[PDB]
Structure 1
Amino acid sequence: MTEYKLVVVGACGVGKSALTIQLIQNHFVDEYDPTIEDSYRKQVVIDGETCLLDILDTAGQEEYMRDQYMRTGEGFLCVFAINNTKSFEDIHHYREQIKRVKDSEDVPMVLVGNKCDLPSRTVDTKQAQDLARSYGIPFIETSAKTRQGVDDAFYTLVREIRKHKEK
Structure 2
Amino acid sequence: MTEYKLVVVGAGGVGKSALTIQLIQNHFVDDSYRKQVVIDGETCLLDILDTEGQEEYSAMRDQYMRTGEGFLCVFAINNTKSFEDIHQYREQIKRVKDSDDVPMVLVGNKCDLAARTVESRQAQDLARSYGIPYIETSAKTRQGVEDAFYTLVREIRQH
* TM-score in terms of structure 1 length: 0.90
Whole-Å Cα distance in 1 between the matches of residues 56 and 8 of structure 2? Answer: 15
Secondary structure in structure 2 of the residue aligned to 1:69: helix
Indicate the larger mover: 123-132 or 63-72: 63-72
Whole-Å Cα distance in 2 between the matches of residues 63 and 141 of structure 1? Answer: 28
Per-residue CA deviations over 1:41-79 (Å, capped at 9, x if unaligned) read 011011111111010000135347743210011000000
Q: CA deviation at 1:105?
A: 0.9
Secondary structure in structure 2 of the residue aligned to 1:44: strand
Distance 1:66 1:56, change over 3 A: closer
- 5+ residue gaps, structure 1: 30-36
Contact map agreement 2:11 2:54 (CA 8 A) in 1 = no
Distance 1:53 1:41, change over 3 A: same
Give the aligned length. Answer: 157
Per-residue CA deviations over 1:110-157 (Å, capped at 9, x if unaligned) read 000000000020000010011101111000000000000000000000
Secondary structure in structure 2 of the residue aligned to 1:6: strand
Contact map agreement 2:12 2:54 (CA 8 A) in 1 = no
Q: Which has the higher helix share?
A: 2
Contact map agreement 1:6 1:75 (CA 8 A) in 2 = yes
Indicate the larger mover: 7-16 or 51-60: 51-60
- Pairwise CA RMSD: 1.9
* TM-score in terms of structure 2 length: 0.94
Contact map agreement 2:22 2:142 (CA 8 A) in 1 = yes
Percent identity between the two aligned chains: 92
Whole-Å Cα distance in 2 between the matches of residues 154 and 124 of structure 1? Answer: 22
Q: CA deviation at 1:4?
A: 0.3
Contact map agreement 1:8 1:76 (CA 8 A) in 2 = yes
1:131 aligns to 2:126 (yes or no)? yes
Whole-Å Cα distance in 2 between the matches of residues 22 and 108 of structure 1? Answer: 22
Whole-Å Cα distance in 1 between the matches of residues 102 and 31 of structure 2? Answer: 22
Indicate the larger mover: 134-143 or 38-47: 38-47
- 5+ residue gaps, structure 2: none
Contact map agreement 1:10 1:16 (CA 8 A) in 2 = yes
Indicate the larger mover: 2-11 or 54-63: 54-63
Whole-Å Cα distance in 2 between the matches of residues 154 and 134 of structure 1? Answer: 21
Contact map agreement 1:61 1:67 (CA 8 A) in 2 = no
